From a paper:
To determine the crystal structure of [name], selenomethionine-substituted protein was produced in Escherichia coli and purified as a C-terminal His-tag fusion protein. The protein crystallized as a dimer in the asymmetric unit and the structure was solved at 2.80 Å by experimental phasing. [name] displayed a Rossmann fold with alternating α-helices and β-strands, which is commonly found in nucleotide-binding proteins. More specifically, the [name] monomer contains a central β-sheet surrounded by α-helices. Similar to the dimer interactions described for homologous UGPases, hydrogen bonds are formed between Tyr102 residues on the two β-strands located at the interface of the monomers, producing an extended central β-sheet spanning across the two subunits. The overall structure of [name] is very similar to homologous UGPases including A4JT02, GalUHp, and GalUCg as shown by superimposition. The outermost C-terminal α-helix is one of the most variable regions and absent either in GalUHp or in a different conformation in GalUCg. The structures superimposed with an RMSD of 1.61 Å and the putative UDP-glucose binding pocket could easily be identified in [name]. Based on this alignment, it can be predicted that residues Gly110, Gln105, Ala13, Gly14, Glu29, and Lys28 in [name] interact with the uridine moiety; Asp 133 is involved in the chelation of an Mg2+ ion; Asp 134, Val 204, Gly 172, and Glu 191 interact with the glucose moiety; and Lys 192 interacts with the diphosphate moiety. From these data, apparent Km values of 45.6 ± 3.24 μM (GtaB) and 42.1 ± 20.2 μM ([name]) were calculated for Glc-1-P and 49.5 ± 10.2 μM (GtaB) and 62.9 ± 13.8 μM ([name]) for UTP, respectively. kcat values of 1.06 s-1 (GtaB) and 0.264 s-1 ([name]) were calculated for Glc-1-P and 1.04 s-1 (GtaB) and 0.293 s-1 ([name]) for UTP, respectively.
Author numbering:
A (entry chain B): 3 to 222, 228 to 297
B (entry chain A): 2 to 222, 228 to 298
The structure:
Amino acid sequence: KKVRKAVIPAAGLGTRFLPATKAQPKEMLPIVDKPAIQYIVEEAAESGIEDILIITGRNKRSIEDHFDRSAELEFNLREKGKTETLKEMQQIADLANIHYIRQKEPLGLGHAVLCAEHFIGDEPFAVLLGDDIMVSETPALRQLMDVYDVYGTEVVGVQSVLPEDVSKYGIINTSGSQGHVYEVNDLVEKPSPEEAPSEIAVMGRYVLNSSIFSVLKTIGEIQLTDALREVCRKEPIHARLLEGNRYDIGDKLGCFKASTEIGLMRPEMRSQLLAYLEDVIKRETKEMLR
Amino acid sequence: RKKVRKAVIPAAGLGTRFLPATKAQPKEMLPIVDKPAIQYIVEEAAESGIEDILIITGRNKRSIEDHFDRSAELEFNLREKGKTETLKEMQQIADLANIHYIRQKEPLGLGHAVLCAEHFIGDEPFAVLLGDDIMVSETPALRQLMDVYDVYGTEVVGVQSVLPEDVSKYGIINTSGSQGHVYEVNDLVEKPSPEEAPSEIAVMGRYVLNSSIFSVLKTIGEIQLTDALREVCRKEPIHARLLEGNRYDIGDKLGCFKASTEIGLMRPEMRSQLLAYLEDVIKRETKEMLRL
């Protein structure tokens, strides 16, 4: 069974970005000129996912609207000649088939994954937390999916991190390592620097099975790791080192960084940007020498 | 001899220059540093001593109206998390001014937009602020315009100079001369070719107008605000104020990025990490370029 369905939980009230997000959702904050959520749906589509369930909350209509056809916008783009544009707008609505479900009250990412139960039903599915953007010749998810196609168990997405960071993330407890594909025997959430049995963390990407669904039912906020953990006791899961560049967007500054770097891949903005940063640094030195 | 206390902020664009960000959400809500662009404009107004703002809004721009109101679910979550600093901050936003909205029913640009405001202001002087730039100033930009009005009581336009190339990006003043910080506008073109332009002094989407401007705007009528200063010019000449502080255009993607960086570097909590990051990027770009 090929992975063809994915789950983006998106019910955060996103308080870290106040006041940008007082009256609009975190998932829509622009990254270069793209809403964060678009990057994630783009990953999925490019990995060959055909159906996404977005677990949404109150006042996130704008997400649903983003991925539909905006009539008034289509008209106005025509009457102005922006055909290349009108076309890029239509493609957004074509990426995937976007389903939505409301998470009732905020009970966390475990609840959220359970809400997907009947939608994915009896297929393996991808989960994508919307917390980092991945630049890669092979889409992050597609990577996790290729490990799945092989092992057929719960695969996790991973990247090494510097110790004294391990408390912010999670952790592969590896006792083996083969290919670009570590092998997982256990798991810990937010391990104190010493408690941490590795330097490798999971990068908000997953492929799971319906199995996991029942497992998470049983265990039952409901942390999703404990389930990926109680699967590991019965059997060993798998993790892929994610080839590509990772931009954490949990922070205000995280978003700043992400915008600049992705900015730098745009040809038209690369030199304009880079020039501009040179001249900001000059101005800052000159000022500080007075 | 009346005080300016009402401003009109026209806000009914589809924000094409910003697609796909603005596909399903308004241009004025795009964040500059961590605050919506629209909030900057209200803030300038508030601190300029404006008490009553009319936003001329369009369809699917509810988020502006929500932004400046109590947000009960947010409030709750903030209390139940302790962020009393933030809860107070949010509460402040909702207090900056008296925000009124009207829908401009059909998009006929500014001018019509301004006419929309007619009954709301009735018979006073008012400010218009198009939001195309953020000004960092000791004295709030609009206040500066207002102080020249207090003295000359004509329509007063806010200005700064620009390099000749970009004089078709603007409306250009046409002085006889100047006196302290107040130029003496004799006429006004729309957006002139670099030689057709009779100055390199451009209007910075600030205006303090008089109620009279309505009569005017009606006679001319696609109603351009500029032409209705042109006619006010025929009978009698208008004033301009050179605007004290630092301007950051945000009409462009790049503009906004520059704005975010500039304003960001002014925030103490941010400054050191941001500067750090910036130096880093250049350092990293150098290494990788020299090895190629």
